[PDB]
Structure formats: structure tokens, C-alpha cells
Amino acid sequence: VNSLSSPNSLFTGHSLEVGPSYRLIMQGDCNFVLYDSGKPVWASNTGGLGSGCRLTLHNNGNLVIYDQSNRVIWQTKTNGKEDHYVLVLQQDRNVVIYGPVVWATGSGPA
Amino acid sequence: VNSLSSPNSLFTGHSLEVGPSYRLIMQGDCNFVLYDSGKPVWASNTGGLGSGCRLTLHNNGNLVIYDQSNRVIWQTKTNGKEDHYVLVLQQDRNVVIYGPVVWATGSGPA
Ligand SMILES: CO[C@H]1O[C@H](CO)[C@@H](O)[C@H](O)[C@@H]1O
Ligand SMILES: CO[C@H]1O[C@H](CO)[C@@H](O)[C@H](O)[C@@H]1O
């Protein structure tokens, strides 16, 4: 999967991927990093500032990283209209937050 | 991949997928269908109305299906602000168009 939809989280050790070389991972050392063939090309730069961290996209558009103590250690501070948003690792290698909802099939949640 | 970002297209025979059972495919018979373990649960219902069709998400949020003659055979008619949007097949099985851009890492296009 290469997307994370609000209000869900990307937990420790998990990542979004766009084959065959792009990997955006919420690391165990709390750093949120984008790797391109093993080389980091973007990151929140929060490694070592915690452990058991998780990345969460909120229904208002704000993207945050919580540590094990459930405290905010990093955020985009993009607080907008209450609705639903999505975080996407694109094939063009850009990582983007889009929202609010423009249209939906209604085939989910299911 | 489970997303399509404007202004790109999902060409004939190609699809978005969220393992292990969700498949949203732009079919060769021009139908845009969402399959759940082989069973269609949502579709544009445009099968047989063309061939060599492609699905395109526009930078204004409008989602369209063009036939081989490059004519519109189906669309969401969601014309909004000029920017960038994304179409996503979610793990909750919903298919959603989100936009405009809220935040970006700027790690792409690259
Ligand atoms: C109501 O919430 C559901 O539907 C909206 C679109 O209407 C999606 O954005 C969201 O992720 C869920 O699938
Ligand atoms: C300028 O276009 C690029 O950046 C925007 C976000 O700023 C993305 O939405 C788009 O798909 C491209 O990656």
C-alpha cells in the first residue's frame, strides 16, 4: 500500500511503498524516513527522539508522530476543515497530504 | 500501487490494488470496476461502450473515462479549484478522490 487515510496510523516498523525503490517508513527509532533504493531522501529528522512511535493523519489534515508516551514529537501543523484526508507516497516520489473529500464511491468502509 | 494522482491516467488493463482482495481496474471493454475477491462491488457501468479506454484524474478534481476516440464516456463532474488531486482505493474498500494539496515533502517529482 502507498497511502494512509485519516484517521488511521502507520505503526512502528511499517511503511508505505511504491515499487521498486520507494519506501516511506515509520521507524522503530521514531524517525519518519523516505528511502530511495536504500538512500534517505527525506525525513522528519526525529530519530532517537523516542521509540514505539506511530504516524497519524487526522481527519482535519494534521499529520503527527506520537512517541510511546503518546506525546507529539513532530507535526505538519496543517489543521483545516474537519472531514477526511489521505497521505500518499507517489510514483513521482513526492509524499503528499490531500483533502478534503471531493468524491467517493461509497464502496467502503466494508 | 493503490492511488492515481492528477493529472495522470490509469490505462487499459491496468489497475489499483490493495492486497489481497481489492482490485480497481480500467478494463479493456471500457468498464471501470472494483472487484472484491473476484466479485464486482462497484463500477462506472460503462462496459461495452468503447475500447482502449483510460481513466484520468484532472488537476481540478474531475475524474473521467475516455474512449479510444478520446471522447468522454463517463465522469464524476467534480470540477473544483485548479491544483492537484489523488484517487485512492483504500484498505477499507472505499474509492475516494481527495484534494486539493494540504502539504507536501517536495521529495518529488524526481
Ligand atoms: C465516511 O468515511 C468514509 O468515507 C469517506 C469519503 O466519503 C472516506 O474519506 C473515509 O476514509 C471513509 O472511507
Ligand atoms: C507540483 O506538483 C507536484 O507536487 C504536488 C504537491 O505540491 C503534487 O500534488 C503533485 O502530484 C506533484 O508531485
d(C-alpha A4, C-alpha B96), whole Å: 12
Tell me how far apart the alpha carbons of residues B41 and B71 are, in angstroms, rounded to a whole number: 26
Q: Answer for the pair A30, A53: CB distance below 8 angstroms, yes or no.
A: yes
Q: Which of A25, A43, A40, A36 is nearest to A93 (CA)?
A: A36
Chain A interface residues (partner B, CB cutoff 8 A): 1-3, 5, 18-19, 34, 41-42, 61, 63, 76, 78, 80, 84-86, 88, 90-110
Which grid cell is B96?
A: 475516494
Q: Are B98 and A96 in contact (CB < 8 Å)?
A: no
Contact assessment for residue A8 and residue A57, using Cβ atoms and an 8 Å cutoff: yes
Residue length of chain B: 110
Sign of the CA dihedral A16, A17, A21, A27? positive
Please tell me the experimental approach by which this structure was elucidated.
X-ray
How far, in Å, is the centroid of ligand 2 from the Cα of B93?
25
Question: How would you write B26-52 as a 3-class SS string?
Answer: ECCCCCEEEEECCEEEEECCCCCCCCC
- The CA distance from A106 to the nearest CA of chain B, in Å, is 6
CB neighbours of B100 closer than 8 A, spacing ≥ 6?
A: A98, B61, B80, B81, B83, B84, B85
**Cell 484517487 belongs to which residue?**
B87
Q: Give the DSSP letter of residue A40.
A: E
Please report which ligand is nearest the Cα atom of B91: 1
DSSP characters over B54-80: EEEE-TTS-EEEE-TTS-EEEE-----
PDB resolution in Å: 2.2
Could you give the CA distance from residue B77 to residue B69 in angstroms, rounded to a whole number? 20
CATH topology of domain B1-110: Agglutinin, subunit A (2.90.10)
Q: Kindly list the domain boundaries of chain A, sorted by start residue.
A: 1-110
* First-last CA distance in chain A: 17
Contact between chains at B98 and A100 (C-beta distance less than 8 A): yes
**Nearest ligand by distance to the CA of B61:** 2
Where helices occur in chain A by DSSP H, the ranges are none
Count of positions (residues) in chain A? 110
